[PDB]
Design a protein around this ligand. Structure first.
Ligand SMILES: [Mg+2]
Ligand SMILES: [Mg+2]
Ligand SMILES: [Mg+2]
Ligand SMILES: [Mg+2]
Ligand SMILES: [Mg+2]
Ligand SMILES: [Mg+2]
Ligand SMILES: [Mg+2]
Ligand SMILES: [Mg+2]
Ligand SMILES: [Mg+2]
Ligand SMILES: [Mg+2]
Ligand SMILES: [Mg+2]
Ligand SMILES: [Mg+2]
Ligand SMILES: [Mg+2]
Ligand SMILES: [Mg+2]
Ligand SMILES: [Mg+2]
Ligand SMILES: [Mg+2]
Ligand SMILES: [Mg+2]
Ligand SMILES: [Mg+2]
Ligand SMILES: [Mg+2]
Ligand SMILES: [Mg+2]
Ligand SMILES: [Mg+2]
Ligand SMILES: [Mg+2]
Ligand SMILES: [Mg+2]
Ligand SMILES: [Mg+2]
Ligand SMILES: [Mg+2]
Ligand SMILES: [Mg+2]
Ligand SMILES: [Mg+2]
Ligand SMILES: [Mg+2]
Ligand SMILES: [Mg+2]
Ligand SMILES: [Mg+2]
Ligand SMILES: [Mg+2]
Ligand SMILES: [Mg+2]
Ligand SMILES: [Mg+2]
Ligand SMILES: [Mg+2]
Ligand SMILES: [Mg+2]
Ligand SMILES: [Mg+2]
Ligand SMILES: [Mg+2]
Ligand SMILES: [Mg+2]
Ligand SMILES: [Mg+2]
Ligand SMILES: [Mg+2]
Ligand SMILES: [Mg+2]
Ligand SMILES: [Mg+2]
Ligand SMILES: [Mg+2]
Ligand SMILES: [Mg+2]
Ligand SMILES: [Mg+2]
Ligand SMILES: [Mg+2]
Ligand SMILES: [Mg+2]
Ligand SMILES: [Mg+2]
Ligand SMILES: [Mg+2]
Ligand SMILES: [Mg+2]
Ligand SMILES: [Mg+2]
Ligand SMILES: [Mg+2]
Ligand SMILES: [Mg+2]
Ligand SMILES: [Mg+2]
Ligand SMILES: [Mg+2]
Ligand SMILES: [Mg+2]
Ligand SMILES: [Mg+2]
Ligand SMILES: [Mg+2]
Ligand SMILES: [Mg+2]
Ligand SMILES: [Mg+2]
Ligand SMILES: [Mg+2]
Ligand SMILES: [Mg+2]
Ligand SMILES: [Mg+2]
Ligand SMILES: [Mg+2]
Ligand SMILES: [Mg+2]
Ligand SMILES: [Mg+2]
Ligand SMILES: [Mg+2]
Ligand SMILES: [Mg+2]
Ligand SMILES: [Mg+2]
Ligand SMILES: [Mg+2]
Ligand SMILES: [Mg+2]
Ligand SMILES: [Mg+2]
Ligand SMILES: [Mg+2]
Ligand SMILES: [Mg+2]
Ligand SMILES: [Mg+2]
Ligand SMILES: [Mg+2]
Ligand SMILES: [Mg+2]
Ligand SMILES: [Mg+2]
Ligand SMILES: [Mg+2]
Ligand SMILES: [Mg+2]
Ligand SMILES: [Mg+2]
Ligand SMILES: [Mg+2]
Ligand SMILES: [Mg+2]
Ligand SMILES: [Mg+2]
Ligand SMILES: [Mg+2]
Ligand SMILES: [Mg+2]
Ligand SMILES: [Mg+2]
Ligand SMILES: [Mg+2]
Ligand SMILES: [Mg+2]
Ligand SMILES: [Mg+2]
Ligand SMILES: [Mg+2]
Ligand SMILES: [Mg+2]
Ligand SMILES: [Mg+2]
Ligand SMILES: [Mg+2]
Ligand SMILES: [Mg+2]
Ligand SMILES: [Mg+2]
Ligand SMILES: [Mg+2]
Ligand SMILES: [Mg+2]
Ligand SMILES: [Mg+2]
Ligand SMILES: [Mg+2]
Ligand SMILES: [Mg+2]
Ligand SMILES: [Mg+2]
Ligand SMILES: [Mg+2]
Ligand SMILES: [Mg+2]
Ligand SMILES: [Mg+2]
Ligand SMILES: [Mg+2]
Ligand SMILES: [Mg+2]
Ligand SMILES: [Mg+2]
Ligand SMILES: [Mg+2]
Ligand SMILES: [Mg+2]
Ligand SMILES: [Mg+2]
Ligand SMILES: [Mg+2]
Ligand SMILES: [Mg+2]
Ligand SMILES: [Mg+2]
Ligand SMILES: [Mg+2]
Ligand SMILES: [Mg+2]
Ligand SMILES: [Mg+2]
Ligand SMILES: [Mg+2]
Ligand SMILES: [Mg+2]
Ligand SMILES: [Mg+2]
Ligand SMILES: [Mg+2]
Ligand SMILES: [Mg+2]
Ligand SMILES: [Mg+2]
Ligand SMILES: [Mg+2]
Ligand SMILES: [Mg+2]
Ligand SMILES: [Mg+2]
Ligand SMILES: [Mg+2]
Length: 272
RNA sequence: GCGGAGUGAUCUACCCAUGGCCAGGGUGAAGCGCGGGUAAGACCGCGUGGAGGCCCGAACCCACUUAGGUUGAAGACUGAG
RNA sequence: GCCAGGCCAGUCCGCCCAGGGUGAGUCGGGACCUAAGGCGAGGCCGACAGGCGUAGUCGAUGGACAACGGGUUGAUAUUCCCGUACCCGUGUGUGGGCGCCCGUGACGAAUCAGCGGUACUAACCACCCAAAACCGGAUCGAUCACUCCCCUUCGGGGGUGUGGAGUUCUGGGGCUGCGUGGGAACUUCGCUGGUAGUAGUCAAGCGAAGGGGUGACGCAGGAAGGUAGCCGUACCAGUCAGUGGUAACACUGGGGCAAGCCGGUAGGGAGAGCGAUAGGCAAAUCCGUCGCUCACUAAUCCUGAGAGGUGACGCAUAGCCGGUUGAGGCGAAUUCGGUGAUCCUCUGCUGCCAAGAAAAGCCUCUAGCGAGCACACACACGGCCCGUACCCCAAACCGACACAGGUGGUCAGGUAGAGCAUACCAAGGCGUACGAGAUAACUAUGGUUAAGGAACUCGGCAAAAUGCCCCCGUAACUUCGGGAGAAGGGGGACCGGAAUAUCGUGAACACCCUUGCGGUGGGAGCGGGAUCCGGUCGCAGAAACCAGUGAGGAGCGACUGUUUACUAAAAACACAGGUCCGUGCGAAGUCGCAAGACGAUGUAUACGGACUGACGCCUGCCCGGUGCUGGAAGGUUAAGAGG
RNA sequence: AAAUUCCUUGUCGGGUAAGUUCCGACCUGCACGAAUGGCGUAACGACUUCUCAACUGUCUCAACCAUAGACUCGGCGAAA
RNA sequence: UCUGAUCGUAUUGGGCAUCUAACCUCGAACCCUGAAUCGGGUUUAGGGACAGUGCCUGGCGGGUAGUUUAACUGGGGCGGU
RNA sequence: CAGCUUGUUGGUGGGGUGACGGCCUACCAAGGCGACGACGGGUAGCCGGCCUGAGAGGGUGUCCGGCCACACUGGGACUGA
RNA sequence: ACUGCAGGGGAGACUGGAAUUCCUGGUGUAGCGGUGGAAUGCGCAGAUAUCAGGAGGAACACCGGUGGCGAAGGCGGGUCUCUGGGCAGUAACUGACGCUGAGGAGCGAAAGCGUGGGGAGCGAACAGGAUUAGAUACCCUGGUAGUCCACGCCGUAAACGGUGGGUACUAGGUGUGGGUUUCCUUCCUUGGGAUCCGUGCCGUAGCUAACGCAUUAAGUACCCCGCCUGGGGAGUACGGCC
RNA sequence: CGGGCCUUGUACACACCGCCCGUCACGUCAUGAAAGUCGGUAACACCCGAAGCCAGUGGCCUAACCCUCGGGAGGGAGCUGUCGAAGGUGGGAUCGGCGAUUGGGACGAAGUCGUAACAAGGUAGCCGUACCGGAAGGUGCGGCUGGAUC
RNA sequence: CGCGGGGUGGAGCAGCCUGGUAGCUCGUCGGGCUCAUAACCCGAAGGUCGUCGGUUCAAAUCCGGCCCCCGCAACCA
RNA sequence: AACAUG
């Protein structure tokens, strides 16, 4: 579902786009929309804390239900599959039988009109949300919460999933999408399946301005700066940087995780 | 030139929110039709459509060449491109 | 007014002096609303100073919200005046209505009373578990008692039958207890006469706390329908411009008028009832969801440019008289076409991905309030605050100057033209502040040049050249799009004929009709576009102005793009694509002493760093040096302990 | 023999009447080299470089014309 | 009384495991609260003597700061002294 | 050598020739040819015959006889049966 | 067409056990590994061995053969779902509807290519060790692409039976795969006979230069297609197509 | 180490002291590529166009016929146009020659360096394909017997 | 020209600031092995330590002079 | 292990 353009212009030579074949109803649901504004990388002090940000198209926030705690047994119906500019997945509008509208991340294979269950008595179908205690092992899940009642945090980009390895007593072993083996509580909730829109990694954005539309502002290498600007700056022709490679703030490469962070008791294995 | 305490982003650099502007001419992407061709197709020829950091060109934004200016009309500009 | 100032003079002036002059329910703002951002009660944080921030409160460049045409002054006018509207509020009448107090209109249970569900499960029964002990076949080894038999150093085995304490398979009790499972009282509910058509609820209006709907949003591209504007013309009022012609349609002027209201056209838009309702912080008749029935093909309803009506028995106007040529008075005709927007229908329609503010306001629901309300006509009233003069592509603003510079938006007519380019002109403005002369060199800005044609020079620098429209025709290479307007050619004016339906645009008179802002033919008048043949003219028909030079070979960077404001626009930077490294979530990273923030309302197909820079084919060897990652056997080593 | 080659105008071929620049090779790489990427590449460039047609006051070699100055008169009137 | 082993008593210290009450939580709910994604309180779910922080102590540290880097010399540099 | 063809393929009315005919012209139709080799390229005057061969074939076109083409190269008409 | 029958024919989804490797924990102590002989290497920081748990990938012991199926390439763990062909009998139906097929089209082992996954073991390249005059090899220790999957491209093989398809005929003997039918049918014996379709071995006539083929022809014949014309140069250059 | 017999493989037969492969160096012959350069041939488009035919025009010239004796009729020259050879300009097509430098090919004698094939050729060999290497060749993956000698 | 390395048997390298011995590898020579040659095996030989001239009882070694070879420098207008 | 050549 990746349409390739034809090379009519130099900016559309290798370019490609989504086919958008999964989407019904091009407009969002008006009560579930909150406004956003840009920042350009600036914090509350007004200074750039994240470089290469700004420009970008105007956006509105779609309220996603990352909790799904309060409808255990009330079934829902997938009404539409909509575009969300705020993320790489598509979103599914749910019509619960009691009368409430919600958005969730659309799993792989949750076409329009499907019924979605929730709670400890749900079926293992793509889109149902259960506690991890009720999911069997080996099941591909997504949108998993770290603490109980805290909201979905893990594996929720497009195409990503967690494999549930095993449950021993009070803890489930998860394989996160990086190869990380993490141990979390079994009262944590997770949605069955795999996040859809899995072909968007193959999109070739064709031109510089197409990434300026998405909010990515240009990026100057440190080796073509001056030594007052970067530790790699300097030289009379072009260099490699006359030192082992560092950040713009002089920090070397290497492990930046806190070596005695509190969650080391929960990590079985680091990523590969 | 060194320090202490302050003042400045009405210029300029970038970002944020909300507005406005872009004469005219050309080329003719996707798609959708219709005809063909096939067991079905790919594919093929017409239409239609109006894409694009597309083309030509004013306003507008620039500043490549050149001449003039150089106790200037102007502490950075004019003319022709 | 004229002694300063204005690049000269000045009787003039943006200069000097005195007086005067700026009128709003509707225009632009506040008294209405929020965005980015600001401030910020309490608060959290920080030795102090202070940092951030919640409620809240400000903040238009945006949202909502009521006015048009004419006349008037020396100076203001959507503000004054005249005509005609619209919006919010207030009082007083008059008029019926709708309610409270009254009735009424439906709805409407709470006393008590007979069994099932078959609760309760005592119990009996289904099931089978070591199916509490136990009898008993049987299991097994180096225990062990009596007795028959053999050897010896006199301590113990083999042939092991019977049997004690028993491992084992189970013949077998298998009652119970241990279980679930149908399964009585106690106790409790579904119904039925019944306290019962009984108390009670609701039945004017207002609700703005709150709920819900709406408000409410991108970009590109039209098409169809109109309209303004413009150009002609019926008709109207005038002209004779001392020249060869021209006495009237030959020429010149006119051929006007808004908001509002009426109207509902073209075009757009929507199925409607009734019931239930885990949701909307309380409630809901509203919203959401679900269900049935009918409607569906339609009709109806809302919407909606324009036409037409009215506003207009008014106002204006060409012109004619009158004129201290300042005032004044009178005042014609106004029809039908063409062409046509950047405006309107249209916040509509189609397509696209990059997925496109909030809040008031408005409508609706209920909580709540509530005995008097709602409404029509008439008359009489209130409608506050600030801005308004003037200049505003400039001599009044920013550049020290009346400075060739800079300054956002709206209006934008004619002939030619594709055009808001260009040339000439209208309406309207201006000749802008030193002049007058004079054929010196020389300098600047334009123009032309015989023969030659890059011989010039670091270099074709500059100049010249090409240039439009329609029709032919077009190479290597290529990523199949391009290259390409490649290259290289031909035609082009005027007059007449084809030519009255030649052709194509719109479509009047009258025929015809389901009676209307209708349809069908019908074809006048008005403009548009080429083509063919014939003729005529010049040196030249793209006519002036305007208006691509082309082709070939290398390097570098793929490309469009950015950059040293003021000597460097590039081969530098950026880029899409690549790879490595970090990061498991108030993540890493950054800003802060911290709190807090950003990253991101994101979650490894994500985010940050580094290097390489579309694409094609590729990217070899070295881990000794130095970093990075992991390890911890050995050596050495801090404070503390020990003393 | 390179945006890299000092020696150096290396040598050979092409282009010119004549070519220290240009294109094609050679390898003797002072001092090339694979993501400070290696070698190619259609399209594109106010980029650098060499050649051709056309075209001309760039030149052989200048000559004339008009305007703004310079120049005379009157007025005002500085500067380093 | 010695080296080696073992054991008792008393004292001191390190591992290892569990606990909950310090402390911790941007996990959840309720109240202050009329309007509150702030804050505080209350209860619950977790974590837990770990972490964080004070004092002391070792490492690393062009990230930042202040500085030094000689003279002679047929100019200085380079060489030599 | 795989797409050739616009008087090209057919019709009508005229013209033309000794004669039929796109032979020419105007108009109308949209055909015609091709893998049974179109359109290109290479070579060649064709034949009665001659040479060879058992024949079938293969090679050849010289004398003589037939027909064709040309007359320095290219183009054109005149006269005349 | 009907009635039966045999089959690793194909595609999709799910799924099973053994072994290899790795990870975690226990026990354990100094070697393991490898070869003709060694060395590199691994280990003493607790390897190899051994037991329990876990993750992951690839191939499917026995059945299994000389056998089956498919046009060829090819095809064997299980189950389910979708699907193609063949054989035999009946003779119900159609009435020569056939055979071959230049061009063309489709399929087509392995290696390789593109994008995206996955990666146990194996293993080009590469690196070290050995051997040797050398050793860019064979042997040993490691080890990247690749081998796997999804979707496309490639279109070649000693793609072979070195044997193009169709048809008819021309002694038998002898195994084996699938049917059908006959006498004592149970003479249990699943035996012999007949017949149809395969797949092997022997063997007559005939053919062949010989080896050999021989009812599955390389025999006797007819129809159609592909190909050959001494060896090199060369399946190369040039042109075109992909 | 040498011999004898039977059997098996062979690319050996003056017979393994056999046969034989590919780089490298030297010589000759023919051939491919190449910046560029020199030719030939047949067309195409446009510009210009002689002769001549045809179509017009014909103010000037003209014996035959007609006449009203003026002339008329008909003709000719000249001129205009369509077509038109040769020439000019342009962009392609196509067939040859030369070309610094470079790719292989064949053959030369007593050259240099290995030993890949033929025997189990000393690691069975060949085929397709990939990567690598002075060179024959090596290794992987699949395949064939045209090998497997116990 | 400066600076600092180097010259050792036929070739390529040690030995030198550690003054008293000149070494390894290939090669050359003689003998094996083989039908013959390579490879292999045994046994030998071969050097003024670039030249000269000092120091020392004594020099490859230490110190000067030359003659060669190699590397790095030779910059600012 | 081992082994080239004429
Ligand atoms: Mg601030
Ligand atoms: Mg970034
Ligand atoms: Mg720089
Ligand atoms: Mg620094
Ligand atoms: Mg640099
Ligand atoms: Mg450099
Ligand atoms: Mg200061
Ligand atoms: Mg400030
Ligand atoms: Mg600013
Ligand atoms: Mg500011
Ligand atoms: Mg356009
Ligand atoms: Mg199309
Ligand atoms: Mg553009
Ligand atoms: Mg404009
Ligand atoms: Mg200048
Ligand atoms: Mg300009
Ligand atoms: Mg004065
Ligand atoms: Mg004055
Ligand atoms: Mg305070
Ligand atoms: Mg604050
Ligand atoms: Mg605020
Ligand atoms: Mg306000
Ligand atoms: Mg505003
Ligand atoms: Mg005024
Ligand atoms: Mg009024
Ligand atoms: Mg919105
Ligand atoms: Mg007159
Ligand atoms: Mg509703
Ligand atoms: Mg009207
Ligand atoms: Mg229109
Ligand atoms: Mg839309
Ligand atoms: Mg005014
Ligand atoms: Mg000023
Ligand atoms: Mg000015
Ligand atoms: Mg501007
Ligand atoms: Mg105009
Ligand atoms: Mg203009
Ligand atoms: Mg002026
Ligand atoms: Mg003059
Ligand atoms: Mg001239
Ligand atoms: Mg001339
Ligand atoms: Mg010329
Ligand atoms: Mg020239
Ligand atoms: Mg010159
Ligand atoms: Mg010169
Ligand atoms: Mg120029
Ligand atoms: Mg010019
Ligand atoms: Mg080009
Ligand atoms: Mg052109
Ligand atoms: Mg004409
Ligand atoms: Mg003329
Ligand atoms: Mg560039
Ligand atoms: Mg451009
Ligand atoms: Mg700039
Ligand atoms: Mg500059
Ligand atoms: Mg510049
Ligand atoms: Mg952080
Ligand atoms: Mg990563
Ligand atoms: Mg890096
Ligand atoms: Mg770069
Ligand atoms: Mg990048
Ligand atoms: Mg190491
Ligand atoms: Mg370390
Ligand atoms: Mg040279
Ligand atoms: Mg060059
Ligand atoms: Mg060159
Ligand atoms: Mg180097
Ligand atoms: Mg590398
Ligand atoms: Mg590199
Ligand atoms: Mg590069
Ligand atoms: Mg550019
Ligand atoms: Mg000169
Ligand atoms: Mg004077
Ligand atoms: Mg450091
Ligand atoms: Mg420093
Ligand atoms: Mg100091
Ligand atoms: Mg000094
Ligand atoms: Mg000196
Ligand atoms: Mg014709
Ligand atoms: Mg005729
Ligand atoms: Mg005819
Ligand atoms: Mg001939
Ligand atoms: Mg014969
Ligand atoms: Mg003859
Ligand atoms: Mg003759
Ligand atoms: Mg002759
Ligand atoms: Mg004749
Ligand atoms: Mg099967
Ligand atoms: Mg296993
Ligand atoms: Mg593993
Ligand atoms: Mg083990
Ligand atoms: Mg299977
Ligand atoms: Mg019949
Ligand atoms: Mg066939
Ligand atoms: Mg074929
Ligand atoms: Mg295929
Ligand atoms: Mg494969
Ligand atoms: Mg692959
Ligand atoms: Mg891959
Ligand atoms: Mg090796
Ligand atoms: Mg190996
Ligand atoms: Mg590859
Ligand atoms: Mg598959
Ligand atoms: Mg095969
Ligand atoms: Mg074959
Ligand atoms: Mg046959
Ligand atoms: Mg058979
Ligand atoms: Mg046989
Ligand atoms: Mg034969
Ligand atoms: Mg041959
Ligand atoms: Mg080939
Ligand atoms: Mg070829
Ligand atoms: Mg014998
Ligand atoms: Mg033999
Ligand atoms: Mg031999
Ligand atoms: Mg040779
Ligand atoms: Mg050639
Ligand atoms: Mg003529
Ligand atoms: Mg040559
Ligand atoms: Mg061999
Ligand atoms: Mg071999
Ligand atoms: Mg060997
Ligand atoms: Mg071999
Ligand atoms: Mg190898
Ligand atoms: Mg191979
Ligand atoms: Mg093999
Ligand atoms: Mg010897």
């Amino acid at each position: 579902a990746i349409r390739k353009y034809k090379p009519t212009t130099p900016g559309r030579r290798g370019a490609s786009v989504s086919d958008f074949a999964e989407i019904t109803r091009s407009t969002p649901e008006k009560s579930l929309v909150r406004p956003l504004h840009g920042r350009g990388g600036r914090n509350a002090h007004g200074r750039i804390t994240t470089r290469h940000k700004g420009g970008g198209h105007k956006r509105a926030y779609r309220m996603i239900d990352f909790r799904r705690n309060d409808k255990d047994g009330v079934n829902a119906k997938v009404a539409h599959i909509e575009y969300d500019p705020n993320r790489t997945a598509r979103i599914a509008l749910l019509h619960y039988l009691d009368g409430e509208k919600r958005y969730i991340i659309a799993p792989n294979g949750l076409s329009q009109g499907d019924v979605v269950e929730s709670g400890a008595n749900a079926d293992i179908k793509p889109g149902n949300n259960l506690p991890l205690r009720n999911i069997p092992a080996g099941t591909l899940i997504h949108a998993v919460e770290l603490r109980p009642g805290g909201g979905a945090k893990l594996a929720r980009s497009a195409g990503s999933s967690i494999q549930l390895l095993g449950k021993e007593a009070s803890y489930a072993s998860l394989r996160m999408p990086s190869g990380e083996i993490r141990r979390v509580d079994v009262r944590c909730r997770a949605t069955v399946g795999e996040v859809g829109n899995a072909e968007q990694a193959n999109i070739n954005w064709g031109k510089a301005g197409r990434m300026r539309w998405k909010g990515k502002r240009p990026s100057v290498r440190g080796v073509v700066m001056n030594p007052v600007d970067h530790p790699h700056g300097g030289g009379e022709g072009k260099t490699s940087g006359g030192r082992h490679p560092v950040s713009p703030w002089g920090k070397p490469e290497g492990r930046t995780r806190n070596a005695n962070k509190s969650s080391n008791k929960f990590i079985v294995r680091r990523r590969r």
